[PDB]
């Protein structure tokens with residue numbers, strides 16, 4: 001997260017860190033046994049880490065649980081990142097508490113202008129690299145569809161939306177992939193892609209979660 005702020009320990013209880021020997025992507029807890037992330041974050045041997053703040057220090061509220069199954073969206077296209085969403089089932093149910101909580105799925109899509117909370121352990125530098133260790137946060141509005149498609153001609157699909165600031169300075173970045181975009185208490189987006197980080201007229205692109213609620217619900221209920 002570039003141009004953001006330190007969230008504060010466990011202030012985003014649904015935020016998870018996917019670990020394969022190191023933090024590599026974010027994710028969102030949707031219920032005690034399931035996490036939603038980006039399909040481009042797929043890999044074997046994933047351990048889901050909940051109740052995390054500083055990812056390099058055991059602070060007392062963590063829960064490390066191995067993934068038992070991963071399900072990349074049936075229509076995921078790695079070249080265009082269309083349908084960049086995947087579900088991860090935990091080998092054992094997470095113990096829900098004030099620091100480890102699920103985030104509700106949307107029942108309808110969000111509108112342009114709506115303010116959302118984006119979080120993650122990604123790079124905090126617009127030019128260069130610096131990884132935080134503690135969770136970073138960023139308030140950003142959903143941009144107009146036209147603004148989004150104008151910034152990324154021919155690349156934006158109905159399953160994507162942009163959020164952030166066209167002036168630049170605030171945006172998600174490498175390492176935030178798979179993380180949550182929450183608006184009005186609903187998980188409306190997943191950190192998917194962008195061009196550089198916090199660059200002018202290059203807002204972040206997010207997976208439009210409201211388009212996948214039926215698939216998410218049906219998939220979890222059948223697995």
Ligand SMILES: N=C(N)c1ccc(O)c(/C=N\CC/N=C/c2cc(C(=N)N)ccc2O)c1
Nearest residue numbers: 024172173174175176177194195196197204
């Ligand atoms: N808003 C932006 N310009 C910005 C730019 C790019 C984007 O990545 C994002 C949103 N995604 C972050 C996840 N990155 C980690 C990651 C880790 C791995 C990995 N461990 N192998 C692979 C792909 C990965 O993407 C935002």
Ligand SMILES: [Ca+2]
Nearest residue numbers: 054057058059
């Ligand atoms: Ca920790």
